[PDB]
Every structure is written in structure tokens, then in C-alpha cells.
Ligand binder design. Structure first.
Ligand SMILES: [Ca+2]
Length: 148
């Protein structure tokens, strides 16, 4: 079922749902979860459409092979762009987290546990984004959309 502006508790992964009202400036996405002890995969995508192969305006991808880092990128016309990386890891083994994306005119502002983490500049117009996709072997307590 499509989300509204009330929290969705214990969503099942993989999660792939339409953003209520489409994506607009001022909107925030709140994700409460726990980064599992044996978590190997985790990503959040702001997607243009619901079909496989759809463009991804913003791919947010904590990575753990070798040195831990968070990767940020865009998939457009079947092509991945130049990767951005932040060489630090704000998620901790087995630890609860609050992950927030605030959609501003210039960038997605990413805040983790109340601490500003990154600002991903828009590459595709943010208004093209229609769906939120989340997957990984972690446990989500809730996903919540706050309208702008
Ligand atoms: Ca590692």
C-alpha cells in the first residue's frame, strides 16, 4: 500500500513505494532503523519511476568492502555517473540510527543521528523523482515522509 504522511512501521525489505505527492522542495524522509550486526548491503534510492532500470536521481550507498565509506551517485539513461565518496562511516555495527534526507533546492541534505553528514547536489531535476527504494539486510523500524 502507498504511504501517506503518517509513519509506516516495520516496512518489509526490499521496499519500493511511491513518494506521497511526488518529490518537492522542502520534503524530508525519516528512516529509523538498526544497522544489523552482519549487515553487508544497504542502499536508499530516489528513483524516477517504478520499472527496473529506471533512472536513479540519488543513490545513497554505505559500503563495507575494504575501507568503509558512503558512496553517492546518479544513474541516468542507463549510465552511472561520477561517484562521490565520503570516507567515513556514520552507521555502527548493531547500532540504531536515524537517517534523514531533506530535499532542498540545491541538494539532498543527509543527516545521521542529528549530525549533518553530506550534501548531494542535484544532477537530475528533483521533480522527476517518484519512488523511494530501500534494501539491505538490516531492520527498519519506520519510514516517514514530511511534506514540504
Ligand atoms: Ca570494511
Amino acid at each position: 500500500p502507498a504511504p501517506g504522511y503518517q509513519p509506516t512501521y516495520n516496512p518489509t525489505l526490499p521496499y519500493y513505494q511511491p513518494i506521497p505527492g511526488g518529490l518537492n522542495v522542502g520534503m524530508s524522509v525519516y528512516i529509523q532503523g538498526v544497522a544489523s550486526e552482519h549487515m553487508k548491503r544497504f542502499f536508499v534510492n530516489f528513483v524516477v519511476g517504478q520499472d527496473p532500470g529506471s533512472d536513479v536521481a540519488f543513490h545513497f550507498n554505505p559500503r563495507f568492502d575494504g575501507w568503509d565509506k558512503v558512496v553517492f551517485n546518479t544513474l541516468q539513461g542507463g549510465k552511472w555517473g561520477s561517484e562521490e565518496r565520503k570516507r567515513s562511516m556514520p552507521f555502527k555495527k548493531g547500532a540504531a540510527f536515524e537517517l534523514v534526507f531533506i530535499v532542498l533546492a540545491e541538494h539532498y541534505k543527509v543527516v545521521v543521528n542529528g549530525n549533518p553528514f553530506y550534501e548531494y547536489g542535484h544532477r537530475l531535476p528533483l521533480q522527476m523523482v517518484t519512488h523511494l527504494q530501500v534494501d539491505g539486510d538490516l531492520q527498519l523500524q519506520s519510514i516517514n515522509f514530511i511534506g514540504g
